[PDB]
């Protein structure tokens, strides 16, 4: 049961033998019984010889109940009873120690599943069924490692170590311990700081976020064996846990009483090491709130070395303890925690691939592992650098492991047939259709034997998916979050961003390429996907491209934040509402803006019209542009490494507002371009900061919307119109002639692709609706809005 | 309810046979007993044959208690005795499974309701009433499926699976489960993310609002059979429900203790799937407050995959757990939910329509299902895209079933007579009036038999309703909230808006058509029913139309919000001044505007004088106009597609206040009109945005009222006057001469139509009260306000 021990399987195959050997077509419980005793001296077999039930004695009974004569042994797979005995044994292996499933369990499970032919064999052969289930148990009903009695004791150590609580050493003396790949430098640094007699308390500060316990298992082992100072004379290691204390209680006072009590029993001092997990909760005080002020008791305890302890703390906690003092300042002392370096990360994963062989889709592929880490590091980007990886391995190590049984080569169809029959078949007999059920059954069951036969032919689709964990695989899971469903996005990025925005194609390919750079690596993993400013008169393609980025990269059209900076400039938005100064940065930092971007990680953040925002707004954005972090609410650091920052503006508005033509000029546009790329891009610097523009990755210039782009934007919008009416069954079209007429509203010198929505609204929505109401056009007929006189005419078509 | 099992009905008809056959005017309890035993082998029938209560034995007894000789069997319906036995058995079949009621329940129920002749027959034939009821019971074994007991494997599964809770698999192995229509793509996406050796936890994000459980029943079914990967062997599905834990528990500590214990038993790990409903509440992370931080225990539990889970949560929340870290970046992991596309919505509906033929109305029409959906989406609208519909289907799927009983040929009249008799009759017996009640009694009871006869002629009242649920039917019900009673609203919208606003009829016809377009389903389902700017001098018809729209569309005169934008000053915050300056965008977004529209979503929102606001307020309105949503207080998306948003303005005041008067012009009036539709529309641009106006749909220009618009509004006001005083029994009428003289105050450039109120008040209300007190006019007496000298002159009339 999961590659879980021979002894089970071994008793079982002898059943199949017995199946045909006396002639049983489904291998009954009588054959299972024989299987056990013919497996000779396994716990099942052995037991039966104890009960007095020899294989002979059993078989004599067996042949007299069924025995003869289904020697044809039709399919010979089990009887459902016999299938239960196996299902039972797995639980009987939980029941009688054995992770894996072997012989005791099968006889015990058999008794449990007493049933007909088995049951009658032993109760006829003068053996009580429970005397047998006993019998197997009392020979073996165990598997054991480490623990096993022999007697040892210590005295004063008793009251303390009893209480309360978990001991890492215990599980490591019984030893099921796995290292698990430390996180070494902490262990040394703890042991100087532990092996003191005043600040004999280590305090581990680090990413949590590595699994603190990896260091802990580190410590455990190293404090025992075998080079440790004489200060740490005859040490014992006990880990403390709040969780048992809080459970079974519901008032604070008892927890504190117990903490006082514990603090007393730790008096085995200079011979005891206490590990205090979740140290922060106990320390309390500080801030505007504590966390539980057990600290009062704990502080002298730490100083005394009775609670000579290791504190596992957090970012903030050290502040609220060295602030407390002086059995909390001359107690505590910090030391720096490790994690497995980005390449090392890859290796940790790899190490547990082979053990994901009960997950049977790892080990392999290397490239997938390497990828697991790397693709995640740059995009999603919602986690720290090592964790992401293994999860992908396993995810995809199931997505595709599913693709195994989704299609065989596509020989899933066999089973599909067996179904179609069954339906017909069954129901045919339920009406009957006696013999008219017959052939359906035969067609069904024809199918059935074939099905079970071809289900172990679908070991080929296992050899296909079931160790692979591919780059592609990994990529797919990263895409699940957000190779495979990332690189089509990468390779075609301009094309895909182009497919939603035609407004300044110049801009689209550039933006595309910047994302493709980050999203294909060689940029800081800390830094965002892209910082940008997109200039051009309002929504040239600008806003729309932010949308198109979301659409293309993430597979969701919108997963795109969007804030207008002109409302909290840090400049003029001091007193827009209020008569006194209170406001603008306080919203921006203090929670509002930052919380919103915190919700979607892979989010095109669009900060609108930053044109007359203060140089201060830019410093905040700058932290993203430099570090790729934002510092905000609840003391959280939000790692901007998956955001795509797009700030729009019309900062030197006038110069932007001179089209990128094409349909008017083709060379005044590239002279508006250079021109907007200086007066704009310098008003950009003048209202922002040059440092800002300097750590903005790219300053994209969009002019006024090309003369050119409009009927293509219109042909997406007018068609988006034609598509949203089709869902409830109305076919509308604006001809190319009518889509041309729609484009005319803005052709632009001072505006973007914004008036186009409105002109679709006027020329499509409004235009169809005044014709559907008047009965020119109807449901389930094609509505041609055409131009054939320089103005719209609503025509009807099939 | 309907569609019951035969066996009941079968025993009953044999009773009726005895009714006349032994001569009883009543199908009595004596006949029912005979009925049971003559129905032979029903459990009731069968039972009686055991105890010794053959048809013979019974009938011998029966004839000795009535038997003879009312062969004519007048009004052969049951005894009241028998009617009780039948009602009881029906519930005694609810009681002992058999929803559709049959024989067993009828004898069992008979004994329970053991009275009259029946009871005595068997207790005379040496069979106790319970000896018979026993007999039915011990031959009964009720009605059930999917269960019969024979035992299955367990061991470690015992403590865990008990606790806590629901087991989706169980009801699906009892095969009572209905799909329920997928909600399919989610289900695959969970198992990649599930069967997994790291990050084993799916987290379903999406619409709530789809019935999450539809996906869940999906999952259940596929996690059993059979393409799930061996990463998790055995595979058992356990649901964890917060609701069961909290019930009977009053303190937090106890709840946590139970969670701790459960989590420990969750040790069946790597084989067990845990369903965590409302996953966020437990995580207790993100924001300034959690929701209970069970997460501490839950996080390692999820990460180990011991409590690997499927989270049914919300869009944002999964993030606000990866925000907690680091067992949500190696535990939780998201996948995108499906709901039934608008057309698909219709199909889900249809699928359970035919079984709310249990309320016997629908059972179809298809077009009506479609109507439910389509009609709802644009008008009320108060709910998400599929939900509205079905409620309406069922609504009309009852509504109209009332209209049957009202219109047969109006054979309600039969019953109407039967009452009138009964009354007369009864009251006559209470005095006596013996034979003077008698003929009334006979007329009554005449009526009665006829009534019950024509009530089963009112199977035509079934044939009327029991599959009709038509377009119109649904529409009428959707209109009950808000085809049928929306299209008389649509067709005559202009007329209806005209009947309440006679103040700038030009404007009225335009608004009428725009609302009627949207309300005919001819606009995006992501946009309001109306966006507008109403330009015009003060309340020309502007305010009045907001009212008239409410009146025509919504079925109540006022279903109309009304907020003055001038309090949200923003850029006009020294250009008018206000008592309270600090808030303004915060005031609208943060609570005020948004809460009001949340109360009735179907509300004509009238934002007066919008020019007295910065362009920033307009962005929110633009977002309403575009998205059809507003994003506000308590993280709500309030779907604007209910509302008719109407924004008024006096923005280009000078042209607006240059009138448009029939009396002096009609060509300068339509050019004061034209003057206002351009110069106003450019003062509109400076106090708005072109972007604003571009997502606003139609800018309606009102002009100060003509000669002639006034005198019709006044004649409504004068009539509003005449109507509210008649209720209290006083008659006033203003002649046409007097309604004209009153109308003149609403003329200026500046005004529009509110001063009409003043002039009706002054010339009618105030004037009449100073004349009723005088003794000029009196009660009931019709008081004519006439003009006979260019001033009001009071004439008196009857």
Could you walk me through the main structural features you see in this protein, from its secondary elements to its overall organization?
This is part of a larger assembly, with two copies of chain A (798 residues). With 798 residues, chain A is α/β, with parallel strands linked by helices. Chain A is 49% helix and 9% strand. The first copy, chain A, is built from 38 helices and 15 strands. In chain A, the strands form four sheets. A five-stranded parallel beta sheet of chain A has the order 2-3-4-1-5, covered by helices on one side. In chain A, strands 7-8-11-6-12 form a five-stranded parallel beta sheet. A three-stranded mixed beta sheet of chain A has the order 13-14-15. In chain A, β9 (629-632) and β10 form a beta hairpin. The radius of gyration of chain A is 37 Å and the shape is flat. In chain A, 48% of the residues are buried. At the A-B interface, α5, α20, α24 and α38 of A face α11, α14, α17, β7 and α27 of B. Chains A, B: This is Negative regulator of genetic competence ClpC/MecB. Chains A, B: Residues 4-69 are annotated as: Repeat 1. Chains A, B: Residues 469-653 are annotated as: II. Chains A, B: Competence gene repressor; required for cell growth at high temperature. Negative regulator of comK expression. May interact with MecA to negatively regulate comK. Chains A, B: Residues 161-408 are annotated as: I.
Figure out the total of helices of chain A.
Answer: 38
Oligomerization state:
part of a larger assembly
Largest sheet, strands/sense/barrel of chain A: 5 strands, parallel
- Which pair of protein chains has the largest interface, and what are the residue counts? A-B, 85 and 84 residues
Helix content of chain A: 40-55%
Decide which structural class fits the backbone of chain A: alpha/beta
Radius of gyration of chain A: 37 Å
CA-to-CA gap between the ends of chain A?
63 Å
Region (II) (chains A, B): 469-653
Keywords (chains A, B): ATP-binding, Chaperone, Competence, Nucleotide-binding, Repeat, Repressor, Transcription, Transcription regulation
Protein name (chains A, B): Negative regulator of genetic competence ClpC/MecB
Binding site for ATP (chains A, B): 206-213, 536-543
